[PDB]
């Protein structure tokens, strides 16, 4: 009945075919951590800290678009899983300023909390640290892209939801810019669902910009007004 | 101490221990202020091409 075994750290479960290897690694209660994998977006395998090793394999498979074959047997603990988990995390705090305190995601940042609970403690790369000027995508959303990781998660929703076609990639290697080329503002509806989107404090909200810290201020369920659907 | 020889004789015996040399009042050696600046070592970490976090 479209069953498939996968062992999840030797525990088994059934699980539909076609799914990732993270959908089913989220069946079992796993989460590996992610950057460019989202649950309402088309998977892009640009962030590779997803990674995590198959038993009997040379190579390191991508959890985020790997489709699940018949029988596997998946550590999410194993050697080198921990070992590219913590070089990932050790190549994308390089190019990223020292910017925590004055950065406004600094209570619900994603590099702190897997650098905190995944990466390595003592860092390295002693020169270096390139730094891009920063855009203004609209008069609502602050931007400051030298926080950027490039992990293309913007243009995704902006192309496959808001359907504007703005935000593009511009450049190669290190000089990956993302933006608008022509000083264009972003101006469509669900601009503003952008900055819950981007994972690093790069986007961020304009009239919240410098006013709060997310540790102290306390989350109250509420529906919305103005709009018939809530 | 910078007493006379008097009452320190008569501290030396109403009391026997030959009080003089140790009094508790501290005079020159006390550590000498504004020492030069330190440098301070660094122990097992931080030596590269080991430090996985996976073995600590
Ligand atoms: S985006 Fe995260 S890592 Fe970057 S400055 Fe802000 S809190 Fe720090
Ligand atoms: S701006 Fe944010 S969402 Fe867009 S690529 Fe950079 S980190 Fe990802
Ligand atoms: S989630 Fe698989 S590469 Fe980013």
């Known amino acids: 009945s479209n069953l498939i075994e996968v062992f999840v750290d030797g525990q088994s479960v059934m699980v539909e075919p076609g799914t990732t290897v993270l959908q089913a690694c989220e069946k079992v209660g796993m989460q590996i951590p992610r950057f460019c994998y989202h649950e309402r977006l088309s998977v ?34 194993s050697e080198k899983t921990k070992k590219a988990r913590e070089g990932v995390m050790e190549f994308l705090l390089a190019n990223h300023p020292l910017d925590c305190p004055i950065c406004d995601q600094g209570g619900e940042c994603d590099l702190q909390d897997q650098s905190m609970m995944f990466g390595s403690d003592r860092s390295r790369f002693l020169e270096g640290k390139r730094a891009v000027e920063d855009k203004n995508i609209g008069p609502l959303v602050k931007t400051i892209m030298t926080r950027c ?24 290697g290190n000089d990956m810019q993302v933006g608008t080329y022509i000083e264009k503002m972003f101006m469509s509806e669900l601009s503003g669902n952008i900055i819950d989107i981007c994972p690093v404090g790069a986007l961020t909200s304009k009239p919240y910009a410098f006013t709060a810290r997310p540790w102290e201020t306390r989350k109250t369920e509420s529906i919305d007004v103005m709009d018939a659907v809530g | 101490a910078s007493a006379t020889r008097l009452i320190q004789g008569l501290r030396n015996w109403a009391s026997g ?37 996976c073995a600590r």
Request: glycine share 6%; aromatic share 6%.
């Open chain 1, 149 to 172: 990781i490039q992990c293309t998660r913007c243009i995704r929703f902006a192309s496959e939801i808001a359907g504007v076609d703005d935000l593009g990639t511009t450049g190669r």
């Open chain 2, 17 to 53: 221990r030959d009080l003089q040399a140790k009094l508790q009042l501290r005079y020159q050696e006390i550590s000498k202020r504004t020492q030069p600046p330190p440098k301070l070592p660094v122990g097992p970490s931080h030596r590269l091409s080991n430090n996985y976090y």
């Open chain 1, 44 to 77: 892009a395998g640009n962030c590779r800290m997803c990674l995590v090793e198959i038993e009997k394999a040379p190579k390191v498979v991508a959890a985020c678009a790997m489709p699940v074959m018949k029988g596997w047997n998946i550590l999410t603990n």
